[PDB]
Structure formats: C-alpha cells, structure tokens
C-alpha cells in the first residue's frame, strides 16, 4: 500500500527538485543582469551628488528637506520588499529591521506612517491590521526610474505637508554577492556635513539664474535618485536571496529523495519477504 505512496512521493520530490534547480540557475543569470543595471546607474548618481555639493557650498541651506522640524510627530517609512516569494529570509529580515525602526520611532514619540513596495510587505502588514497609506507592486523585479520618481514624489509631498516630519526607507543593501543586509536609511530631512576646505585659488562657479533656485529644483531629484538606487540594490539583493534559497531548497529536496528511496526499498524488501512467508506457510500447512 505505502509502496505506491512512497514511489509517488519520490516522484513528487523529484519534480520539486528539478523546479528548484532550474529556479536557482535562473536567479544566477538574473542577478548578473541586476548587478549590471545597478553599476550602470551609479555614475549619474555620483555626478548629481557632486553637482549638488558644489551647489550647496554656495547657497542658502534652509530648504524644507534640510531642517529638522521642532517636535516631529510622525515619520514616513518606505519598506521595500519583493513580490515573488521563493526568496529566503529576505522579506523576513526587511520586516524585522522595519520593526526595530518602528520601535526606535515610538521611543521618540513619532507614530510611523507606512508606505510599502511589494506584495510580501502588504501581506505582512495587512495581517497585523496596519494602515498602509500607499502601496506599490509589480516592479520589484526590474525597477525603472519612473517608479522611483513616483515613489519619491509622493514621499516628499507627504513630507512637505496627513503629513509627516521625516522620511525613512528600509531596503536590502547588496554587497559581496553573499551579503544582503536590511538597512534603515533616513532620507529626509538631510543632515548637513561640512566636509573640508578644498577651496584655495579655485575658481568660483556661476549659477543661472542663481544658487538657491537650482538647489531647490535639484534636491527632489537627488531624493529620487537615492530611491532609485535603493530599488536597484533591493532587486539585486532579492535575486541573491532567491538563488541561495533555491540552492538550499534543491539540497533539501535531494535529501528527501534519498530518504524516501531508502524507505521505499526497505518496504519493497519487506513486502517480498512477507509474501514469501505467506506462500511457504500455506505450502507447509498443506504438507
């Protein structure tokens, strides 16, 4: 009886193992591509940071995104997670990091407002009766700049206002192809960091129309660039997590195949022995 069931379970485990190995190799390819996209999006970020720093060294640092409002009452948390689910502890680490961030915010009197990117975060927070202000799905695999623009625009417009006093983001930093760390960044308001002098006989810049207009039309673009880099890093991290999860899953399926085959061969021998016992028992009963 259980010989049929054991052979069926062996076939099931073999199917699962084939699928998981395929998914692991696919994830390897896709993370190669995601690392490529991240590295090629890096230079524009570097140069907009340089332009912003050389604009701020000669402007008025009183932009709304730069002052820490007195008595902050609420903080906006953007949690960047995945849509497909065959990742490992990816969304898990994201959510534990965001919970640590929520407790940090509540130990300073700020009720967090929640924006999410992905389906798994929406499951995690809809299960816990949270109130997610706005959600975003379907672009965690290949994020583009228009998605980052939309996200960052809604965020800065909720910050400049039902209205929050600072913007945080929780995403997975990608590094090493074996490091995927859920990090909480504070994207608003920015702290200002006087770096250096690095200004001797250097020639002063010329701004058109002036310094502050360029600064205040370039800052939201900087926040959008940072959100885009966050989305790209979280995508590459999700693909790394999926590759590792599918490797471990195919290993577990292989070990289950081995154990089920051992038990099935054990039963097979047992059934042959018991059938022989019955046959010979009858034959001896007749003699």
């Amino acid at each position: 009886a259980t010989l049929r069931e054991l052979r069926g379970r062996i076939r099931s485990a073999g199917s699962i193992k084939k699928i998981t190995k395929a998914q692991e190799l696919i994830a390897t390819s896709r993370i190669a591509r995601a690392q490529a996209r991240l590295e090629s999006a890096r230079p524009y970020a570097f140069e907009i940071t340089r332009m912003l720093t050389t604009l701020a060294a000669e402007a008025a640092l009183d932009h709304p995104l730069l002052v820490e409002r007195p008595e902050p009452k609420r903080a906006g948390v953007l949690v960047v997670s995945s849509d497909r689910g065959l990742c490992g502890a990816y969304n898990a680490n994201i959510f534990r990091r965001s919970e640590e961030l929520f407790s940090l915010l509540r130990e300073a009197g700020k009720q967090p407002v929640l924006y999410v990117v992905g389906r798994k975060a929406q499951n995690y927070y809809s299960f816990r009766n949270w109130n997610i202000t706005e959600s975003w799905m379907g672009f965690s695999e290949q994020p583009t700049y228009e998605n980052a623009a939309e996200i960052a625009s809604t965020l800065v417009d909720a910050f400049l206002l039902e209205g929050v006093d600072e913007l945080h983001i929780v995403y997975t930093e990608f590094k090493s192809m074996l490091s995927q760390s859920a990090e909480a960044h504070r994207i608003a308001p920015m702290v200002v960091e006087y770096v250096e002098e690095d200004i001797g006989p250097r020639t002063l810049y010329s701004f058109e129309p002036d310094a502050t207009m360029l600064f205040e039309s370039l800052l939201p673009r900087y926040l959008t660039t940072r959100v885009y880099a966050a989305l790209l890093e979280s995508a590459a991290s999700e693909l790394a997590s999926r590759q590792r999860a599918m490797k471990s899953a195919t290993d577990n399926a292989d070990d289950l195949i081995k154990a089920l085959t051992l038990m099935a061969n054990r039963e097979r021998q047992a059934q042959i022995t018991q059938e022989i016992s019955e046959i010979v028992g009858g034959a001896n009963a007749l003699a």
């Binding site: 940071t49 640092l61 730069l66 919970e99 009766n129 909480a184 920015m190």
Partner: protein, 42 residues
C-alpha cells in the same frame, strides 16, 4: 428565512497592531543621507 433574518440583526458576533516586543534600533545604525558641503562653517 424571516426568522433567520430577524435573528441575525440582534446576533452579537465576536469579530489593533500587536506589540512584537522588538527592541529599539541603535540610533547610529540608522544611516543619515547628508549633503557633503565643502565650506567649513561650524
């Protein structure tokens, strides 16, 4: 049908975020996005 309908209005069916007891993040683990201005002005 009507008895059920007139009963369901008075029925008291027995249908908030939990605590999760997660500790606070270290204030220096939260990364700060900074404008790295090049004029030394304390």
């Amino acid at each position: 049908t009507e008895v059920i309908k007139n009963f369901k209005k008075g029925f008291a069916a027995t249908g908030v975020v939990p605590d999760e007891h997660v500790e606070a993040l270290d204030e220096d683990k939260l990364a700060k996005e900074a404008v790295k201005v090049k004029k030394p002005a304390p």
